[PDB]
Amino acid sequence: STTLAIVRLDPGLPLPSRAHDGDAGVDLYSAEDVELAPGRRALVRTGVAVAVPFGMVGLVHPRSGLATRVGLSIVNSPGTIDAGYRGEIKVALINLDPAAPIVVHRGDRIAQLLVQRVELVELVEVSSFDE
């Protein structure tokens, strides 16, 4: 029922879309062809920008297929999209395999975006824990 407004900076890729009814996330495509050598990393454009509602957060998780099969992970997992943010969503990929380079193709699904409520807690300093 909640609508995440999204801008397609790259009109050559489809709107991302929740593939199955209860799935927690929606895959983000690569907008660029990259090769990652073992242990090397890359910030990769996804061709979209989103408006996470106030009181929620965008969360970029790596895909279990790419990671087991090939050792493709995310350096800053889970990547935080703040509600204030309105730039292109990018993914900090890293090749955590010791020998095989990974090739990403513009079009490939290379992460999934979750959205969750987040307690925007008020910090209050105290002297000692009476709790």
């Binding site: 879309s17 199955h20 279990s64």
Partner: protein
């Protein structure tokens, strides 16, 4: 922004395969028979949020709509659209493997591409998708995920 007319042909073909009248697809999407007809013929191009509403109405995930499109953009036609009954049967298994079997759920790259591969193998062994059970698909499905 508008999708490039071939989505018209894709929705019409899939609507017919889905045994749906323009009435049923109208009473589900909110689009009038007029707008569905102007989409399906090419008069009006399908907006980017309209393809999402169509998918839901048809009962097909928009991703397949986008990958069928991609077939056209390369070859000039869609083998998958042409033979969408063979593909729908295989995908419903592939879909059932993924959501119910550890060996598939964690090792899968693309549900679309993996359904392609499993047809190629049933085809090149001269077997029918209509002949085989979930267990035969799964066995072969686990192989191609190495």
């Amino acid at each position: 922004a508008e999708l490039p007319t071939h989505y018209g042909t894709i929705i019409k073909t899939l609507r017919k395969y889905m045994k749906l009248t323009q009435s049923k697809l109208s009473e589900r999407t909110g689009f009038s028979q007029n707008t569905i007809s102007n989409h399906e013929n090419g008069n009006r191009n399908i907006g980017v949020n309209e393809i999402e509403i169509y998918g839901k109405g048809l009962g097909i995930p928009s991703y397949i709509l986008h990958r069928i499109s991609d077939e056209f953009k390369e070859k000039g036609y869609s083998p998958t659209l042409n033979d969408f009954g063979k593909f729908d049967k295989m995908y419903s298994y592939v879909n059932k493997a993924y959501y119910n079997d550890g060996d598939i759920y964690y090792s899968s790259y693309d549900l679309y591409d993996e359904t392609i591969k499993l047809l190629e193998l049933l085809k090149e062994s001269k077997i029918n998708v209509n002949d085989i059970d979930y267990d035969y698909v799964l066995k072969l499905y686990k192989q191609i995920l190495s």
